[PDB]
Amino acid sequence: AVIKNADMSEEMQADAVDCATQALEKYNIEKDIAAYIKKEFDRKHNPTWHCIVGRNFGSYVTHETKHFIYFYLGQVAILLFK
Amino acid sequence: AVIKNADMSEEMQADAVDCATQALEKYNIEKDIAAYIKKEFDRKHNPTWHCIVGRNFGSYVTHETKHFIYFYLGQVAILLFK
Amino acid sequence: AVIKNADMSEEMQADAVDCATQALEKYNIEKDIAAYIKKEFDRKHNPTWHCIVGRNFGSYVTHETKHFIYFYLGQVAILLFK
Amino acid sequence: HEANTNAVILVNKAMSHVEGGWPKDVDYTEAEHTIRYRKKVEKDE
Amino acid sequence: NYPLRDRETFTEPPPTATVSGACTQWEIYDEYIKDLERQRIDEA
Amino acid sequence: MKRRLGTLEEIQAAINQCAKKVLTISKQLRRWVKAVLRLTGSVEGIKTQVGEYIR
Amino acid sequence: SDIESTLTRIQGHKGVIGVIIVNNQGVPLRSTFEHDAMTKQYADLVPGLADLARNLVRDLDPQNDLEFLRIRSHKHEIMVAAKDDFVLLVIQDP
Amino acid sequence: VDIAAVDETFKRLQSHKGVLGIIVINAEGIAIRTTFDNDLTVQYAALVSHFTVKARSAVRKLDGDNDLKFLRIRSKKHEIMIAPEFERSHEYYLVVVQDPSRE
Amino acid sequence: LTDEEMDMCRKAFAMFDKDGSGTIDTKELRTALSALGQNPTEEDMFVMISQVDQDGSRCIEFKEFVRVIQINKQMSADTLDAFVALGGNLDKTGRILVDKLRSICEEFELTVNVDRLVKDADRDLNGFLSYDEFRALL
Amino acid sequence: QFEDMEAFLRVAKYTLVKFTDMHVEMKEEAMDICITAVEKYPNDAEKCTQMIKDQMDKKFGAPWHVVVGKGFSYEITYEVRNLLYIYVGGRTAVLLWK
Amino acid sequence: NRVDSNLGAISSTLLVELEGFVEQNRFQKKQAELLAIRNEEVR
């Protein structure tokens, strides 16, 4: 897995990567990918997340101190945060 | 400026709003708002008060009959009471 | 039991802590938390208390000579004072 | 001994734009390394 | 003189919802063809 | 069509004289019955929708 | 009597092992199999590939669409004619 | 040198009728040789990578001992041809785009 | 939600915003009410629009048009008309009075009729029709 | 019935709002500031989002969230009356939520 | 034509059109003669 930018505890970075990869393996469309990646992590840790999946998107977003993750898998991109 | 529940005189609810809103714009954190307003509001109207400010709140508190405000202002609501 | 700040006798603090927590567990709504936390602690000691429950609020309070309590427990914020 | 605020959160702002798929921070799209990476994947028998 | 009465607090946090969508060149093309069609409908 | 496009009793009377009139035009020249039943049922439905509306 | 005659012709050539028609969401109607423990396999696996491929083709230049598709495995040639009403499958080893 | 051989294979394929394009993309969705510009390249690489791993997982799930050496999607404009060779130390799903309308 | 409701919604939106503004202004609305006979105040129509205007425009549009038709329609297909035919005047009792049918055949003045239908739609074989066998009649 | 991408780009200059829960003055100000952002920097889109949410940060709300792009997907939780999704230039699209 | 352009237009008519409903009464005069007229030719 490829990570370009993150500022958060690595012990749940492993949680993020194992949450995203089985999602990407299972479903076959990219709306339900951003559905699941929020949904299951939302029932895991916190009340609030936001998650983007696609290619060639631009964004500015206020960070969270220990919740900001920018994945990269197989020319398919994921962002999620609080 | 929206008030919801009150029984004070109209002249002092106007005094309360003109005390509170410019003080809200003056500061940026909201511990010191609820020090500054209550100290001022001691020196202006009557010798003892308590105020709370903030968001997502619940309380149960005893107001002398002619003293109660429930602001709902900038989505930072203020409640103040004798 | 995380207590940030107080100036007050300590077995009454014990009553504070347990009458906060079992009130929180018995109840399930935001307002009735501070409803019980007054009402019981009210009828036990003294006729005058004031009590606040929620998250992301704020107040200064004048120093009560011997009866002041603040909690922080399981993303629940509670204040008690005389 | 008499004032209170909740545990306040902290937030500044961060950016992200996605371009391409090189392995890691070994390689960057806005540089020359792409050429040499394709070179070391071009000559294997 | 004056007595003591008590009140409670009902705080409504602003309403929230969840929105999910997928932007792709096919979606965009179809919508513009629709926006153009209503233009002809308005014109006619 | 009259099912599609259905003080109240004046209007209901007028509707039912109109249905009588359809049959009178027929006179100058069994499903008769069932058409007439669903018509009257629909008219009563109009009346009770109104009656719940005033509540 | 043209649809069923074409079904009967197409199911009797030298390699064909099954013809399937499936609706929009599912419901494989008019299979051709002596048991139905693997029809449902086709019906819920393949139209994901058909509409995923319509995504791949159409994304490029939106005047474009998809019409057919073939997947040739080692021992099978899964040909799918996808379109708006349904998805259609014919299986054949050459 | 074999680099002349593979470039020669590009002119072997590309000398055929109607063949608009040839490109090679590895398992990490990054193109290696091209024939297009750079952005049609990267969008092919991403799209076809995801699509072909879904299709191979489909065929392997459908039957345990059967894999695919072939893939052919159709347009009304151009018949994209994907070939993969799933192996270790190499899995290079080359993809051609062609159509018999032109010339 | 359906496809012909969009047709009727477009036709009625054409009827209201009659000049072609693309937005329902108050004057065309009062024109529609005055064609229907009503000439109310210029303060109640303000409140009516302000409940229907969501965007702050003081003018309602097709999205708001179908929003109000959607809420009023689907909040409050063949169940009601066949139901309220005669048995829906009885409200889940299954016993229809013969005198109602005699009155129906009385008022519409029909030339020849024999009521053997109710004699030969009798499926409980008592002399009345429950609702399921009533649909079996229909 | 135009017959390429290019005649589509000749027609497609409008900025249709795909879905939006915003006040009309809210809508016009946000819509125009986003079109000025997209026309200002077509190449580097990161600093388009810089400009969009920092203007909305100082003026309208303390929290804001802008996403511009070419092809993507999203699922967000957003407080109501503050959501903008528009198609700009017949290709680029922008999600915007508080 | 003479026996089934009538009897597939006699069954195509619409009697009631779109208080004042007395106009309907007047309206239902007119088409009455219609069917009567058509019927005579088929007879």
Author numbering:
A (entry chain K), B (entry chain L), C (entry chain M): 8 to 89
D (entry chain E): 60 to 104
E (entry chain D): 178 to 221
F (entry chain C): 878 to 883, 914 to 936, 955 to 980
G (entry chain J): 2 to 95
H (entry chain I): 2 to 104
I (entry chain G): 15 to 90, 97 to 158
J (entry chain P): 5 to 102
What do the authors say?
The ODA has a single large dynein motor that repeats every 24 nm and influences the frequency of ciliary waveforms. Here, we report a single-particle cryo-EM reconstruction of three-headed axonemal dynein natively bound to doublet microtubules.
The structure reveals that β-HC, γ-HC, and the IC–LC block forms a core structure surprisingly similar to cytoplasmic dyneins. This core is expanded by an additional heavy chain (α-HC) appended to the tail of β-HC and the calcium-responsive light chain LC4 bound to the tail of γ-HC. All three heavy chains are connected to each other through their N-terminal tail domains. The tails of β-HC and γ-HC are architecturally similar to the tails of cytoplasmic dyneins, consisting of an N-terminal dimerization domain (NDD) and a series of α-helical bundles connected in a zig-zag configuration. The NDDs of β-HC and γ-HC form a heterodimer that is similar to the homodimeric NDDs of dynein-1 and dynein-2 and is located near the ODA-DC at the doublet microtubule surface. In contrast, the α-HC attaches to the outside of helical bundle 6 of β-HC through an N-terminal, kelch-type six-stranded β-propeller that is located 170 Å away from the NDD of β-HC and γ-HC. The conformations of the β- and γ-HC tails are supported by a “block” of intermediate and light chains that resembles a similar subcomplex found in cytoplasmic dyneins. This block contains two intermediate chains (IC1 and IC2), each with a β-propeller domain that interacts with both β- and γ-HC. Our structure shows LC4 bound at the junction between helical bundles 6 and 7 of the γ-HC tail.
